[PDB]
Amino acid sequence: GITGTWYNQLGSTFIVTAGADGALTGTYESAVGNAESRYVLTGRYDSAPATDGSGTALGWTVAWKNNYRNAHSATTWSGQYVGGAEARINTQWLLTSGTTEANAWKSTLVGHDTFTKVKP
Amino acid sequence: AGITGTWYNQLGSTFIVTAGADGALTGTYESAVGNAESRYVLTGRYDSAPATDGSGTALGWTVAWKNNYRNAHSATTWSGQYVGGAEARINTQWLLTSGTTEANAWKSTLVGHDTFTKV
Amino acid sequence: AGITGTWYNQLGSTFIVTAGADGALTGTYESAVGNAESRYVLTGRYDSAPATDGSGTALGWTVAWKNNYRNAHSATTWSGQYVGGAEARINTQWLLTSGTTEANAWKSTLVGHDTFTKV
Amino acid sequence: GITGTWYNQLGSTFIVTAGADGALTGTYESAVGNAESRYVLTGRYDSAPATDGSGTALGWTVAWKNNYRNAHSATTWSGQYVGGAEARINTQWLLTSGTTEANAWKSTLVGHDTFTKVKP
Ligand SMILES: COC(=O)c1ccc(-c2cccc(-c3ccc(C(=O)OC)cc3)c2NNC(=O)CCCC[C@@H]2SC[C@@H]3NC(=O)N[C@@H]32)cc1
Numbered sequence: 001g002i003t004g005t006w007y008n009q010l011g012s013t014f015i016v017t018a019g020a021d022g023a024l025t026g027t028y029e030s031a032v033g034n035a036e037s038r039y040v041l042t043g044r045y046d047s048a049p050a051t052d053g054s055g056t057a058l059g060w061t062v063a064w065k066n067n068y069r070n071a072h073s074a075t076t077w078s079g080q081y082v083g084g085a086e087a088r089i090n091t092q093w094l095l096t097s098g099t100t101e102a103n104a105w106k107s108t109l110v111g112h113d114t115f116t117k118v119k120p
Numbered sequence: 121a122g123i124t125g126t127w128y129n130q131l132g133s134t135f136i137v138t139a140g141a142d143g144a145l146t147g148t149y150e151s152a153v154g155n156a157e158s159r160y161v162l163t164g165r166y167d168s169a170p171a172t173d174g175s176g177t178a179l180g181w182t183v184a185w186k187n188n189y190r191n192a193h194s195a196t197t198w199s200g201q202y203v204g205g206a207e208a209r210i211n212t213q214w215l216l217t218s219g220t221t222e223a224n225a226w227k228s229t230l231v232g233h234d235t236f237t238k239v
Numbered sequence: 240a241g242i243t244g245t246w247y248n249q250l251g252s253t254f255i256v257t258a259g260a261d262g263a264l265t266g267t268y269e270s271a272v273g274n275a276e277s278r279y280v281l282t283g284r285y286d287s288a289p290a291t292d293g294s295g296t297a298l299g300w301t302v303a304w305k306n307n308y309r310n311a312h313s314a315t316t317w318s319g320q321y322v323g324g325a326e327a328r329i330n331t332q333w334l335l336t337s338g339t340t341e342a343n344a345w346k347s348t349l350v351g352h353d354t355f356t357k358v
Numbered sequence: 359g360i361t362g363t364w365y366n367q368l369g370s371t372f373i374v375t376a377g378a379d380g381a382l383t384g385t386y387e388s389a390v391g392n393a394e395s396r397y398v399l400t401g402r403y404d405s406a407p408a409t410d411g412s413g414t415a416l417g418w419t420v421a422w423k424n425n426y427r428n429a430h431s432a433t434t435w436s437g438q439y440v441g442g443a444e445a446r447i448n449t450q451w452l453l454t455s456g457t458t459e460a461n462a463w464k465s466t467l468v469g470h471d472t473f474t475k476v477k478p
């Protein structure tokens with residue numbers, strides 16, 4: 001299932017609980033792995049996916065503020081979970097920083113992360 | 121107080137949100153487009169201690185397009201910033217991912233942009 | 240004739256383009272923002288036999304941000320559609336990738352949207 | 359170098375010439391590999407990249423019309439070339455279809471392709 005501990009290709013750790021009715025809740029950490037590296041996340045997933053072999057759509061957000069650091073920015077990941085022997089979450093993400101209006105054109109980075117349950 | 125309220129976008133969609141002191145966003149979304157009807161749950165996060173220079177407040181939220189009436193097997197995330205003042209706005213870009221087979225994964229994700237106006 | 244001409248976007252940038260019968264786009268771009276000065280070469284492609292229903296004409300182009308004056312070690316692609324008529328527009332989304340090291344590759348690419356008006 | 363024959367994870371083939379002053383020109387084909395699968399591409403690249411170990415920025419466009427088929431759509435790839443023993447082009451792409459104004463919200467797909475010179 002979705003619930004568990006996931007790792008992406010940057011060594012970030014994504015610890016998530018999937019609620020019965022579609023909630024995602026947990027913590028997202030950089031590869032450093034200490035308290036300063038950890039941030040709250042919340043999101044949603046399709047809690048009744050199709051039964052035709054399709055993945056399970058989901059998304060979540062981290063705002064990059066914790067008790068140690070604030071980068072004045074937020075990332076959202078949008079993607080799908082694929083179960084089976086080597087479960088995976090395949091995502092694309094948007095990382096928006098707070099900017100002036102003049103700098104808004106360079107406010108948003110885009111990328112892609114793939115998560116598995118294999119600890120590096 | 122700034123983020124909390126009712127917002128409409130350029131497509132006529134409805135975003136009702138409460139911003140909590142801990143950085144939480146919670147509310148409901150009604151889409152003007154696509155395989156959707158009635159309200160959907162949303163959840164997200166925002167920077168609860170934004171810069172006090174002249175920059176926006178970063179935020180994001182997710183809707184999974186399942187409620188008690190319909191299920192589109194998909195989810196949208198909006199990533200953007202809130203700009204306060206007399207004419208408050210939230211400027212976003214979004215990613216809408218559908219659950220797909222592996223063979224269709226290459227075309228799972230739509231991208232676009234929405235601007236919300238506070239009402 | 241429709242696409243061919245001079246276009247400005249919401250940031251004040253200048254897009255001069257010729258659309259060839261074979262689907263080619265060729266021209267020059269002047270950016271209002273970023274590490275850029277004077278004109279840059281652009282090249283792209285468009286659908287030279289678009290639908291004749293009420294839909295836009297798909298197109299895209301690239302600028303590498305190197306000319307004889309400056310080099311930002313980056314390139315933007317715009318992907319979008321042309322809508323003709325008395326008030327012609329090109330509505331685009333864009334990706335701006337910088338050359339990076341491997342360690343910085345995760346933050347190589349900006350995304351946004353530009354609307355162009357024909358003048 | 360960039361000039362040569364590349365393949366992505368979908369088995370598409372990207373045959374490109376990189377001109378001295380920044381032009382990219384060539385053909386892009388689906389995994390089917392026949393005439394009907396092939397389309398013209400043009401783009402640009404940084405013809406004087408940094409010398410600090412950074413990749414080479416580039417982009418290109420395909421409009422999905424040839425003498426056989428027309429999908430009324432265009433893809434742009436934006437990314438970077440990384441040289442060395444296993445050269446790679448890492449990209450993100452935007453695929454826009456011509457739509458009515460009412461359907462413009464669902465006009466644009468986003469994804470990512472990685473290219474190598476290894477023929478599947
Ligand atoms: C007023 O002060 C500031 O404005 C300020 C202060 C400190 C730092 C800072 C300094 C060093 C490192 C980070 C950092 C780097 C990476 C990660 C990370 O990947 O966490 C998962 C977290 C923090 C720093 N913060 N940067 C962030 O919080 C943004 C992290 C974005 C990570 C992105 S999300 C998409 C992609 N997927 C990942 O797993 N990671 C990347 C930035 C800004």
Ligand SMILES: COC(=O)c1ccc(-c2cccc(-c3ccc(C(=O)OC)cc3)c2NNC(=O)CCCC[C@@H]2SC[C@@H]3NC(=O)N[C@@H]32)cc1
Pocket residue numbers: 226366368370386387388389395422427428429430431433451453469471
């Ligand atoms: C009036 O008629 C129409 O509107 C019409 C007619 C036929 C078809 C059609 C039918 C079957 C297959 C294709 C097709 C599929 C894939 C590829 C391909 O990947 O080529 C590289 C090309 C064509 C078909 N066309 N589709 C396209 O040309 C779009 C291909 C988009 C491929 C994307 S670019 C990003 C990503 N990276 C790749 O390498 N491939 C994918 C679509 C529309």
